[PDB]
Amino acid sequence: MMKRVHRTDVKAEIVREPGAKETTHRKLIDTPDGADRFVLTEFEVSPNGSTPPHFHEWEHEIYVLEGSMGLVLPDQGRTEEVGPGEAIFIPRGEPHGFVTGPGQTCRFLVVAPCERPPVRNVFLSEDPYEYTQMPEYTSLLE
Amino acid sequence: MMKRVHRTDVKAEIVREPGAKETTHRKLIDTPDGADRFVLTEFEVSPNGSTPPHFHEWEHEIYVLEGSMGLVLPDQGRTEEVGPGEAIFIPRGEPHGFVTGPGQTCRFLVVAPCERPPVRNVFLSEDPYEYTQMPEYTSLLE
Ligand code: NI
Ligand code: NI
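YS: structure for the whole thing
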């Protein structure tokens, strides 16, 4: 039951979240391994990538491994550039999303609880990509 | 309450565990930040380092960032060399320790629960460094 795996031996899968662009995940340590309280996932956002800003009743603990990206913070009216070696705590309920420009790629770890109630979008739409069109979202990027 | 910190802005402190050698930790995300279920710590084992092999009723999830070290596995009679990009799940109760030779340095993340009952040593002694003297420990190293 001790598990050792190299990141490259865990398949990178496209994330399921509707409206995410250019984003994959590798479930490095997960419940089938015997994790029963928290899990470890490696995300990678390739150039021109983004996730819809959202919030949820479960905290994030993040460590940026390689590259750089924007941490979109709707309740702070802006986007924070993050880079290697940064640790980020996002408390339950704080809105957040991720973005990369042409040219940027970022790989980062996310620690999550095993219990993860549904996420709520900051921007509500039937087309889950519409946030990229919205002035209230682009204003956060600049 | 969102926290962003670079690793170099979190002080590296010597670990408290008696008999550990050349090992520090940086508490990157911890309970004063608002983490209330799991925490994120960066360990670094400098050359000629080690920790006393132990076991405990709390799992480890590890990601090796830089360098290499031995993961000592007393119940498997050996030591596994680990290196960058490896994810390691150590279930509750599995004995484990860390070692570096002359020449090796390793930096790795550990995710831990906030509740952490006391560790138990594999090798019992009054001098907490005595494990490095013991044939049953050196046999694991080779
Ligand atoms: Ni999230
Ligand atoms: Ni331990």
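YS: worth flagging: The first strand of chain B starts at residue 3 and ends at 6.
IM: good catch. Also The longest helix of chain B spans residues 135-141.
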